Amino acid sequence: AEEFPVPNGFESAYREVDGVKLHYVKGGQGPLVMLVHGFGQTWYEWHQLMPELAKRFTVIAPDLPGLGQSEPPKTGYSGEQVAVYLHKLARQFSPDRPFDLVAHDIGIWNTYPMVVKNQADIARLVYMQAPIPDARIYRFPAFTAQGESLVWHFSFFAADDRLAETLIAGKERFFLEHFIKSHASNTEVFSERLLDLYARSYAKPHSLNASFEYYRALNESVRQNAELAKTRLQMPTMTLAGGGHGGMGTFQLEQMKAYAEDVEGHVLPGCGHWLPEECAAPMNRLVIDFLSRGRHH
Amino acid sequence: AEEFPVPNGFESAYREVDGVKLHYVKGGQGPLVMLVHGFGQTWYEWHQLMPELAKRFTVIAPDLPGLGQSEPPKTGYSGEQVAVYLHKLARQFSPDRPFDLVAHDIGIWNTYPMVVKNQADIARLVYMQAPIPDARIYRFPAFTAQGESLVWHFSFFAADDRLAETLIAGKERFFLEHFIKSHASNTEVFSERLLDLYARSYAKPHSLNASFEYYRALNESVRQNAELAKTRLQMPTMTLAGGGHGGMGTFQLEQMKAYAEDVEGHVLPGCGHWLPEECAAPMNRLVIDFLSRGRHH
Ligand SMILES: *[C@H](CCCCC)[C@H](O)C/C=C\C/C=C\C/C=C/CCCC(=O)O
Ligand SMILES: *[C@H](CCCCC)[C@H](O)C/C=C\C/C=C\C/C=C\CCCC(=O)O
Numbered sequence: 351a352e353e354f355p356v357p358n359g360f361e362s363a364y365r366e367v368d369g370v371k372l373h374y375v376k377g378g379q380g381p382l383v384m385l386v387h388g389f390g391q392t393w394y395e396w397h398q399l400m401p402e403l404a405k406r407f408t409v410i411a412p413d414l415p416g417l418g419q420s421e422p423p424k425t426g427y428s429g430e431q432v433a434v435y436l437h438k439l440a441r442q443f444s445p446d447r448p449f450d451l452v453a454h455d456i457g458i459w460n461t462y463p464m465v466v467k468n469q470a471d472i473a474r475l476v477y478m479q480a481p482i483p484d485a486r487i488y489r490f491p492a493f494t495a496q497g498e499s500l501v502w503h504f505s506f507f508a509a510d511d512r513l514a515e516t517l518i519a520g521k522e523r524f525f526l527e528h529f530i531k532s533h534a535s536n537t538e539v540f541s542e543r544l545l546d547l548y549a550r551s552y553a554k555p556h557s558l559n560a561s562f563e564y565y566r567a568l569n570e571s572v573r574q575n576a577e578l579a580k581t582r583l584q585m586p587t588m589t590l591a592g593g594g595h596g597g598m599g600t601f602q603l604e605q606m607k608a609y610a611e612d613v614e615g616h617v618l619p620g621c622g623h624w625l626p627e628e629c630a631a632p633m634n635r636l637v638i639d640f641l642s643r644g645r646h647h
Numbered sequence: 648a649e650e651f652p653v654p655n656g657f658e659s660a661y662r663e664v665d666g667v668k669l670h671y672v673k674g675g676q677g678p679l680v681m682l683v684h685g686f687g688q689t690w691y692e693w694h695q696l697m698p699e700l701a702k703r704f705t706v707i708a709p710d711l712p713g714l715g716q717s718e719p720p721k722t723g724y725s726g727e728q729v730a731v732y733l734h735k736l737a738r739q740f741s742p743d744r745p746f747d748l749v750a751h752d753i754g755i756w757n758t759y760p761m762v763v764k765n766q767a768d769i770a771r772l773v774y775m776q777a778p779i780p781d782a783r784i785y786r787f788p789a790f791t792a793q794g795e796s797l798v799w800h801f802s803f804f805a806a807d808d809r810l811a812e813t814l815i816a817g818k819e820r821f822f823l824e825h826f827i828k829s830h831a832s833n834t835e836v837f838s839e840r841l842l843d844l845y846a847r848s849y850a851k852p853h854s855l856n857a858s859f860e861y862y863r864a865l866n867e868s869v870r871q872n873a874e875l876a877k878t879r880l881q882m883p884t885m886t887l888a889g890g891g892h893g894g895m896g897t898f899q900l901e902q903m904k905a906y907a908e909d910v911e912g913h914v915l916p917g918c919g920h921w922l923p924e925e926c927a928a929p930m931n932r933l934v935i936d937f938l939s940r941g942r943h944h
Contacts, residue, residue, distance in 0.1 A: 498802035
């Protein structure tokens with residue numbers, strides 16, 4: 351039973367990686383692009399980009415461990431542990447050439463360590479809508495003159511006593527609509543059906559727990575990245591960020607300038623956090639153009 | 648019916664103030680001291696301090712509007728609105744002499760405007776464990792490298808669509824144990840029996856909602872205080888803050904110096920947010936000594 355509709359010409363499949371059965375959706379022909387989703391979502395957030403990219407690339411969109419239909423990690427939820435699974439998954443399909451990487455929200459957290467540690471394996475990189483875990487996150491204000499901030503969920507999700515699982519269980523659909531819309535500029539892209547699908551997915555008890563275990567490991571990821579960041583990223587990089595409500599604005603490119611030698615960035619006016627859905631057409635175009643001056647079918 | 652045991656020699660009573668029935672506990676003889684509790688608790692947090700103060704003062708400990716056994720406010724939950732109720736209640740019992748004030752957590756928010764607008768009515772002032780609402784609160788971090796953000800609850804409680812009531816209803820006792828203990832250094836004083844008492848009270852639907860409405864009005868209170876703070880406090884003031892997990896440390900005194908000409912502050916080591924319970928002996932001593940520098944019975 352697929353949690354989300356698979357687009358035509360794609361297959362929903364599973365691979366075992368280090369004892370963890372990972373789910374992904376794959377299609378297309380050419381060099382590999384891996385698309386890594388973020389919190390609240392699954393591979394499905396890429397379902398509009400995937401058929402376009404599949405015209406020139408092999409496209410794979412895994413579910414993060416514990417989310418969607420992927421088994422939880424057996425090592426842990428820090429960025430360095432999770433990135434092992436995603437790197438080895440990508441290499442099962444592109445063992446002989448570098449692959450491209452596109453990540454959104456905690457997809458960044460779960461890929462940056464494998465990018466920095468295996469730079470020869472990464473052809474081009476696209477990061478959108480999340481800080482790389484480092485000391486900058488310790489500055490983000492808890493509360494704003496307009497009300498709730500964009501980052502208080504860090505502490506809510508990281509709290510112990512299974513605080514988030516316990517308060518959200520039985521209200522998963524309600525809470526998902528709230529945080530989607532509280533980080534959105536364009537809420538009308540989110541149908542009741544789409545919200546139902548996302549909510550059913552992360553409401554699985556192991557997926558609800560997995561969602562927050564990424565945040566309970568966030569400080570460990572920050573400490574890990576403090577060492578990894580001694581090595582600057584050398585591949586061509588693009589950042590994308592929303593310019594509207596929920597968007598990260600200039601922070602995305604400005605942070606990446608400290609990590610990457612070769613980086614260009616865009617801020618999308620009128621768009622919030624959920625770029626693949628709120629601003630599908632211009633985000634698809636920027637990603638496709640950026641990846642298509644590298645190499646492709 | 649009493650939500651909490653009234654100490655020997657005190658009366659539990661009610662008084663209508665501008666159409667709102669406020670509950671209070673009162674005892675002793677001499678000049679008046681009003682003790683104003685904060686979020687998650689009621690008049691009862693003062694129940695160990697009250698018999699000692701009552702040897703020298705008339706002591707009144709009201710329930711904040713909507714909390715404990717007091718009716719919700721009819722005007723609103725901003726600091727300036729709620730302070731009217733508390734000032735009028737005090738002045739019912741001390742119409743012709745200044746009175747003393749002790750306030751904890753959001754009891755500060757709900758008293759600071761009537762202090763600065765009626766400085767001749769306040770003989771001495773003791774504030775503990777809360778910022779006065781102003782622009783400084785917009786810089787407190789959402790997420791910390793160590794420990795936990797003390798202030799992320801600001802956005803949780805202020806989030807719209809009744810987010811906090813919807814998630815917490817039916818789980819009030821679990822949530823109260825979590826946020827009390829996470830803001831505590833000496834957690835062992837919060838026995839299940841004591842947590843049961845506090846949770847039964849704020850689980851009343853109108854009390855659970857009232858609790859969060861104080862935070863939904865926080866931005867308004869900040870705007871109110873920007874004008875009010877053009878006049879510094881002139882009466883003798885003392886600040887207390889915990890030095891341990893959950894405590895505000897030096898911030899309490901350092902902010903108060905911007906508001907008061909005559910202020911001394913204490914940081915209590917090994918004590919978190921809940922000073923009357925975690926550190927009863929040194930806190931009671933500090934308060935009694937400070938208020939007994941003035942006229943007492
Ligand atoms: C995923 C967010 C999911 C939203 C639902 C809970 C990650 O947990 C967070 C990624 C992005 C969140 C948005 C804001 C990041 C904060 C940066 C603000 C920078 C300010 C600036 O422009 O300088
Ligand atoms: C009552 C909170 C206690 C109940 C827990 C849910 C008020 O809402 C908050 C009062 C006291 C603690 C919060 C603020 C800390 C004040 C200054 C922060 C100094 C340093 C920093 O953390 O930024």
